[PDB]
């Protein structure tokens, strides 16, 4: 089909994008074989290009290049405002691990909505709108996915929108008008794709003159969703429960749930890789993926012993949220390692102790 290649232009670069386009294509001619490049023999590439990563063999495919430059300025009262591609969100997307390739659908759904918006596809004949709801138990990183989806969408849609904006509204809170007029001021630039994010929308319905401010925010949402370049992002923790009125509002609803032992193992692998990269886990060892274990039928030998053990830690980590899971190597290292350097076996033993102590606290909440 179409092969997608992401080019991370350096912040200090001053090159025309047309020129960064021609250099990367020359590089693809040589290797011609999902791999990421960080170093280049070309002086032009060394100067202007941080990394060129290919995202899902033969040369002759219809290859699309997305060249982007991160916006370092971080992170409008009272709201968080970022310019996309933002430097805070770099790599956020690849970090999020989900069972059913949720991210792919989500991207594809929102990508298609924008295409129907752009072609003025009639809502009454084919169902689409500009609201996306992500619902599910807490701790699945729903807000990180909205941020990650918005950065991806900005990078991928570079030929239609020159930059992206993300405005994050905190659920906890005239003043609203002052805030939506600035948002409208950003939306008035048709060279941008404006994302508005409302975290824990259900909190408005749950906590309810404060009835009037909640309703005023809905009319303001209603006014901004009217625009070609607006996309709205909501998240709710009461997945099972019906909600007012983001349910009716959102044509794209996606359920996010706790990670399986298959994902936990993908997550942990990414963590240990990081410690090995940083040399906190030393010396570096090979770890096996779940497919690799399956192909050796889980035999235990020097090659696989430690990967099997990590597997078993992933299975006993089930029922923990993804938020807990990425914090665990911190506590593992702080609580049990207590030293600048560890062998990978030493770290796995810290990680398991870590996992045991987590469930001990759970049972304390139950009792």
Swiss-Prot record:
Q: Which GO terms describe its molecular function?
A: ATP binding; ATP hydrolysis activity; identical protein binding; transcription coregulator activity
> What CDD domains has UniProt attached to this entry?
RecA-like_Pch2-like
- Keyword tags: Acetylation, ATP-binding, Differentiation, Disease variant, Meiosis, Nucleotide-binding, Oogenesis, Spermatogenesis
InterPro entries for this protein = AAA+_ATPase, ATPase_AAA_core, ATPase_AAA_CS, ClpA/B, P-loop_NTPase, Pch2-like
What range does the record give for the signal peptide? none
Q: Which residues bind ATP?
A: 136-143
Chain segments annotated as transmembrane: none
- The SS bond pairs are none
Protein name (record): Pachytene checkpoint protein 2 homolog
State the species of origin.
Answer: Homo sapiens
Q: Which gene encodes it?
A: TRIP13
């Amino acid at each position: 089909p179409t092969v997608h290649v992401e080019v991370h232009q350096r912040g200090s670069s001053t090159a025309k994008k047309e020129d960064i386009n021609l250099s990367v294509r020359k590089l693809l001619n040589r290797h011609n074989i999902d791999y990421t490049w960080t170093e280049f023999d070309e002086p032009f590439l060394t100067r202007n290009v941080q990394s060129v990563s290919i995202i899902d063999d033969l040369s002759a495919c219809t290859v699309a290049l997305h060249i982007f430059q991160l916006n370092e300025d971080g992170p409008i009262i009272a709201a968080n405002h970022w310019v996309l591609p933002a430097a805070e969100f770099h790599g956020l997307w690849d970090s999020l691990v989900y069972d059913v390739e949720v991210k792919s659908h989500l991207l594809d759904y929102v990508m298609t909505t924008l295409l129907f918006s752009d072609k003025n596809v009639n809502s009454n004949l084919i169902t689409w709108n500009r609201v996306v709801l992500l619902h599910g138990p807490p701790g699945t990183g729903k807000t990180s996915l909205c941020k990650a989806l918005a950065q991806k969408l900005t990078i991928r849609l570079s030929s239609r929108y020159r930059y992206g904006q993300l405005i994050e509204i905190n659920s906890h809170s005239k003043l609203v008008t002052k805030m939506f007029q600035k948002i409208q001021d950003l939306i008035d630039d048709k060279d941008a794709l404006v994302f508005v994010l409302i975290d824990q929308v259900e909190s408005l319905t749950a906590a309810r003159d404060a009835i009037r401010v909640v309703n005023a925010v809905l009319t303001q949402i209603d006014q901004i969703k009217r625009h070609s370049n607006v996309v709205i992002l909501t998240t709710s923790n009461i997945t099972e429960k019906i909600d007012v009125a983001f349910v009716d509002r959102a044509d794209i609803k996606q359920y996010i749930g706790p990670p399986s032992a298959a994902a936990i193992f993908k997550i942990y692998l990414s963590c240990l890789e990081e410690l090995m990269k940083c040399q906190i886990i030393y010396p570096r060892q090979q770890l096996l993926t779940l497919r690799e274990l399956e192909m050796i039928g889980f035999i235990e030998n020097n090659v696989s012993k430690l990967s099997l053990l990590l597997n078993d830690i992933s299975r006993k980590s089930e029922g923990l949220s993804g938020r807990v899971l990425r914090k665990l190597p911190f506590l593992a290292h702080a609580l049990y390692v207590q030293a600048p350097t560890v062998t990978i076996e030493g770290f796995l033993q810290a990680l398991s102790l870590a996992v045991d102590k987590q469930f001990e606290e759970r049972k304390k909440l139950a009792a």
